[PDB]
Design an enzyme around this catalytic site. Structure first.
Site, mmCIF file in Angstrom:
data_model
loop_
_atom_site.group_PDB
_atom_site.id
_atom_site.type_symbol
_atom_site.label_atom_id
_atom_site.label_comp_id
_atom_site.label_asym_id
_atom_site.label_seq_id
_atom_site.Cartn_x
_atom_site.Cartn_y
_atom_site.Cartn_z
ATOM 1 N N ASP A 17 -3.694 5.293 1.128
ATOM 2 C CA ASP A 17 -4.253 6.054 2.237
ATOM 3 C C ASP A 17 -3.857 7.509 2.133
ATOM 4 O OD1 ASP A 17 -5.354 3.748 3.306
ATOM 5 O OD2 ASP A 17 -3.565 3.335 4.497
ATOM 6 N N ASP A 54 0.794 -1.160 0.000
ATOM 7 C CA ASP A 54 0.000 0.000 0.000
ATOM 8 C C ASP A 54 0.876 1.279 0.000
ATOM 9 O OD1 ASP A 54 0.082 1.092 2.750
ATOM 10 O OD2 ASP A 54 -1.810 1.966 1.953
ATOM 11 N N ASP A 112 1.063 5.383 1.331
ATOM 12 C CA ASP A 112 0.471 6.345 2.273
ATOM 13 C C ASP A 112 1.001 7.753 2.030
ATOM 14 O OD1 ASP A 112 -0.765 4.184 3.710
ATOM 15 O OD2 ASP A 112 1.126 3.847 4.674
HETATM 16 MG MG LIG Z 1 -1.792 2.344 4.152
HETATM 17 MG MG LIG Z 2 1.717 1.445 4.257
#
Ligand SMILES: [Mg+2]
Ligand SMILES: [Mg+2]
Ligand code: NA
Length: 327
Positions: A251, A193, A195
């Site tokens: 995110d 992921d 961020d």
């Molecule tokens: Mg994240």
């Molecule tokens: Mg992360």
DNA sequence: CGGCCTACG
DNA sequence: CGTAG
DNA sequence: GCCG
């Protein structure tokens, strides 16, 4: 070896990879059974090995290391003697472990949901797809995108994503900035992921920013999924690939510039590092740390920080750059 | 024995 | 309940 | 599961 992970540098790559991994299997397993204490001990023991300057070759080298008691020492002993730990292999093999791992990987499914499904007899992703009335909209997105989300993202992909986020942010609020956080800021070359932390140099200007950013990214056709005032957005983005694209978890977080050092610190991790840092703060220094600030509950005041360096200083810890926070 | 990070969506 | 690190 |  200090007892808290926030008191020692932990590099991303180290000299005890196999040992630390095995301990982390047992930590993960403990989490699937709801034993957070055992998870923490096995995580801490694994992290201690990551912080060592050379390989553990003999059982006597564990003597005096924090978080190594009878159980963790036996795991290491078995690995040193036979190259394998029977408990660890039993966990790896187990239907419980494999299914709980599979289900908890799904965006929108935590340990409690996974366990309930397991108890109901469900074992596979297609088992879940056959009963879609049982799924939340978040879980539906998580399940649809699971295959893409299981493939890690490269740093070159992250740089492309950051540019598109910066364009949207610049329209939403000129002068707002975008900082890469998470594992990539710790030096990871790939990760599951991405961020971003968003702020503005004029305190207060960031209020109401995240919906404006989200609307703009939506209008660009980049958002495959999102939850919708707010300050954290857990998204699935469309990432360009040769002749196509893939789903990626992104995110987005907004903080006022006064809180930026705290948010940067928290969102940079690692998870264990931050838990350990907050534990250190409260238990050793009597101060309460979160991603918004650092509170002295005696004087009833918040510490103003202008940098992560300030925060480490106020806690009486030697500064660790992000690439030494890989606890 | 108690404690184990601390928030937001 | 989920999410984050 | 381990620390204090
Ligand atoms: Mg994240
Ligand atoms: Mg992360
Ligand atoms: Na999950």
């Amino acid at each position: 070896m200090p007892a808290y992970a926030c008191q020692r540098p932990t590099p991303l790559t180290h000299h005890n990879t196999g040992l630390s991994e095995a301990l982390e299997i047992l930590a993960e397993a403990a989490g699937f059974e709801g034993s957070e204490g055992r998870l923490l001990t096995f995580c801490r023991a694994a992290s201690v090995l990551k912080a060592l300057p050379s390989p553990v070759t003999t059982l006597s080298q564990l003597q005096g290391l924090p978080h190594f008691g009878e159980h963790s020492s036996r795991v290491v002993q078995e690995l040193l003697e036979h190259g394998v730990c029977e408990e660890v292999e039993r966990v790896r093999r187990s239907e419980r472990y494999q299914t709980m791992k599979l289900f908890t990987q799904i965006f929108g499914v935590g340990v409690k949901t996974a366990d309930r499904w397991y108890r109901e007899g469900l074992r596979t992703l297609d088992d879940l797809r056959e009963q879609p009335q049982k799924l939340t909209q978040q879980q539906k997105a998580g399940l649809q995108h699971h295959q893409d989300l299981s493939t890690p993202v490269l740093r070159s992909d992250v740089d492309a994503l950051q540019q598109v986020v910066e364009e949207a942010v610049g329209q939403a609020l000129p002068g707002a900035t975008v900082t890469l956080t998470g594992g990539f800021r710790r030096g990871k070359l790939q990760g599951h992921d991405v961020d971003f932390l968003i702020t503005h140099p004029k305190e207060g200007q960031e209020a109401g920013l995240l919906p404006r950013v989200m609307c703009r990214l939506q209008d660009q056709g980049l958002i495959l999924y999102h939850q919708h005032a707010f300050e954290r957005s857990f998204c699935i983005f469309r990432l360009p690939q040769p002749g196509s694209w893939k789903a990626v978890r992104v995110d987005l977080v907004v903080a006022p510039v006064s809180q930026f050092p705290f948010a940067l610190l928290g969102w940079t991790g690692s998870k264990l590092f931050q838990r350990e840092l907050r534990r250190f703060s409260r238990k050793e220094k009597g101060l309460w740390l979160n991603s918004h600030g650092l509170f002295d509950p005696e004087q009833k005041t918040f510490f103003q920080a202008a940098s992560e360096e300030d925060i480490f200083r106020h806690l009486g810890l030697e500064y660790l750059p992000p690439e030494q926070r890989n606890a």
